[PDB]
Amino acid sequence: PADFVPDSVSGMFRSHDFSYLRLRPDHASRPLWISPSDGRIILESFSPLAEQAQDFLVTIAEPISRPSHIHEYKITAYSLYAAVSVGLETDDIISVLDRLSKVPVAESIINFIKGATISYGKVKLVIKHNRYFVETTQADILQMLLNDSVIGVHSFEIANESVEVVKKRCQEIDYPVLEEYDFRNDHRNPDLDIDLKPSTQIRPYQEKSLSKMFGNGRARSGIIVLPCGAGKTLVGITAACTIKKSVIVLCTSSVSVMQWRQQFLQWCTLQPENCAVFTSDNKEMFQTESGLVVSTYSMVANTRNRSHDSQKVMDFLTGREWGFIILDEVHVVPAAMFRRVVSTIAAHAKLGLTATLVREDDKIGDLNFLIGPKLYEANWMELSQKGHIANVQCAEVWCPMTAEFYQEYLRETARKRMLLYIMNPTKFQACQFLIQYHERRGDKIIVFSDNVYALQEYALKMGKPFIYGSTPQQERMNILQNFQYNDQINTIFLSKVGDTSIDLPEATCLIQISSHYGSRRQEAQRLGRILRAKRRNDEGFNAFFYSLVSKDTQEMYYSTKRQAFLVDQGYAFKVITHLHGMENIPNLAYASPRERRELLQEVLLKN
Amino acid sequence: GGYAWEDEIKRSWDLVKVASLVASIVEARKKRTAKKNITPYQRGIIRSLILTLDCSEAMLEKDLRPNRHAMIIQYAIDFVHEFFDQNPISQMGIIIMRNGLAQLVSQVSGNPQDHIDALKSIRKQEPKGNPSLQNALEMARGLLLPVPAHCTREVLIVFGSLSTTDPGDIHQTIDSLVSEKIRVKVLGLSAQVAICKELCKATNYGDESFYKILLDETHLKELFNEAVTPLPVNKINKGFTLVKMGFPTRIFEDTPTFCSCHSKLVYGGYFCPNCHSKVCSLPTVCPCCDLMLILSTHLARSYHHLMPLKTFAEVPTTEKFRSEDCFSCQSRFPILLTSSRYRCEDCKQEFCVDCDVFIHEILHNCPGCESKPV
DNA sequence: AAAATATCAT
DNA sequence: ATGATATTTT
């Protein structure tokens, strides 16, 4: 900022004016704008050099919003650490960024990238038989590290329980800890002989995502983020196959554990001799020299009370050293107790796979020092164009609340407030009409409802099935399998159990009469349930995602806050004030005033 | 046995790292080289063309968006308009190969509206079956029989398939076509075909340049436009003769009268100079005394073919220029490397690039030559 | 069928 | 800190 005349309207911009820097002569070619103060990056995807720019920016930046034309990126310390990790240096990053920038990079930005691009590889952590040695080839630097009281060629054994403490501490200190494991060199750990089946073929983006993890030829821990239905299961299977070591899979739910077992079997050469599932249904353990063990977070994470039969298997899990560990649905690892899974199980390489890297609290960033940096990410819109994930036309139906119903809403307390608008008679009519209309088109409809009471009430009235916690595992699986392969049972209701980590290609439409409090994770996960429809490549096909809300209620506030993640990724919500053809429906629930009054009394009697 | 993942990262950005006016001139000169050679080849102004279109399963392919059938039909409409504008005296007929048989869709006549309407109706028809060159050629051979001898028989097959299912020996038809002096032009769509090449070569006195296969959507229009112009005739072939014709006079009448051609009430028409019968439109054979009625303008349109304007040669940069502005349109020649001046040989007057294209495509007389007093 | 511990949101 | 919902065990 020198020899620059402030603009007359510069007051409109609160010190964010960047007119002092002059536009480059070749600005018509460069696709990037760099904001000095905020560090934001504006990228034009319709200009030359778009494709490789997007790949480069994603590597060095964490995407914020990616609409059709203008992509908004941001640079953070964690993003820079991930970039330098995958075979990159400050010299290359600076040259590329300056080359692609429509305007010269400010000195403030240059300092930010420079600082965090030099600490890559000073401190290393390795795992011997069952003892963790935080060693390094050089001897002088570690001596400085050891002097610190927080931690407690040089190699020293560190307490297994306190491993997380040092990992965070290394992040706090200038030098962050690196997680690399040369699976080719070490053969002491028994090797599992497995390879992808000849029929199987890796998709382009799946190949690229796995390439980043193995860019240097050695496996490195990290998190791979792909849209729901992208195929993270196959990415994990391929990652396990290439390492050729023992692999342990931790999964959110037992139903998904079965999916991993089947998916693993369908897409690799492994035989049942080397597969064992440590789930509630059965505690079978593999006796082979090495193999795959798939379990769930609750079983491994549990500390106080675990049965002796489960204890023996858990001791078996903790006994042998493992080569690979897949943390499926890694968005719940930062939970209070699930963090112990990483520490208890000793694995050289840990890979996290999730579709929605979102968490209400500030614990999402902790993943960078529990598993590894965010290695790769994919655009939801980009995959939709390629035909890998079915297109969805999201909508947010506005259901007005009737006067009799609304008056009781105001007087009631907050906790009782939820049940008034969830059981809105107008909302009930909207749900019935949408289901009837979309059932005519031969479309499978899944109706999520977090409120169990409302879920059951809607299901009983509509004569349709439902799944939630009380339902046993056998019944839940039977409904899932039946709904997939039976014409009569075209629609099934669900609850919070089915929100995340379930595969069902048949589902194409989707509704939510009720939902949990404002939380972007559940919205994205529920939307992803219908993003893998098998009939996604058919010409002129569009899946549907309906969100029923009550006007003037707190649900409107939550719904707007509950779809922020989808808006950032690219999805757009359309407001449907009027549903055409609803009046002509011969039968509508709670049409008569007496029925509405009876329902109001019934719902009020709940509390 | 390591996979491609372990090798390295692609590093796409590494691939990208950080004279036109003369190029256009030399490119124009290379293109102008093909136009340098031009001689007044004798061409048959009067012609009868039978347009054969392939409507078979091969048309359902999406090589030409939206489908081959749609693009061929659409460009056929344009060809019909262009063909009858450049050649007013000529007559045309339309045939289509469908369901393994040749189906006639419009009788050979000289009315462009009838042919345009026939093609428009074919739009909805869904192509199916296999094509049959022999059936189309046999039907075309019959159609070109009543045509007068002085007329030059012509067949323009738009073939799209790769195989032909005929009921008989197609080689006999090729010999028969040569006997009747019928020249066949084939516009293939996918790849060369042995029979198609033989048919064109045999009927065109051994010339192999009458069988063309396009390479993209754009090239199709150029191939269609080329067939509009009349074809040259060989020295050995003789068809010199006179044709009786008359020029009727437009007549204005207060009360409508019956037309001899269509027996319909029309306010105006052209009175024949032999039988005084009125005809709605021109140029058509008189319905009563069967002498082709035409206006002087119809003959005029074809004069430029007989005596084409000689191509212009770009002046060398070293040599001096006649003037600083274009003779015709008075547009200053840009100062620029290589002078962009073209002079006509006969009158030696420079012209601009816009005039050079205009004076040889739309306007068929050099402005300088007419201005020169003899 | 009842207990007890986690998780996710106020 | 509390209330729902879910999961695991006895």
Ligand SMILES: Nc1ncnc2c1ncn2[C@@H]1O[C@H](COP(=O)(O)OP(=O)(O)O)[C@@H](O)[C@H]1O
């Ligand atoms: N390469 C592939 N070819 C075909 N189908 C694939 C491929 N990769 C993944 N899929 C399919 O994608 C669907 C969802 O995969 P999954 O791993 O469950 O997704 P998520 O990322 O939500 O965990 C499954 O039906 C699976 O068969």
Ligand code: BEF
């Ligand atoms: F992201 Be998936 F639906 F597990």
Ligand SMILES: [Mg+2]
């Ligand atoms: Mg999954």
Ligand SMILES: [Zn+2]
């Ligand atoms: Zn008439």
Ligand SMILES: [Zn+2]
């Ligand atoms: Zn007459």
Ligand SMILES: [Zn+2]
């Ligand atoms: Zn000119």
Ligand SMILES: [Zn+2]
């Ligand atoms: Zn001249």
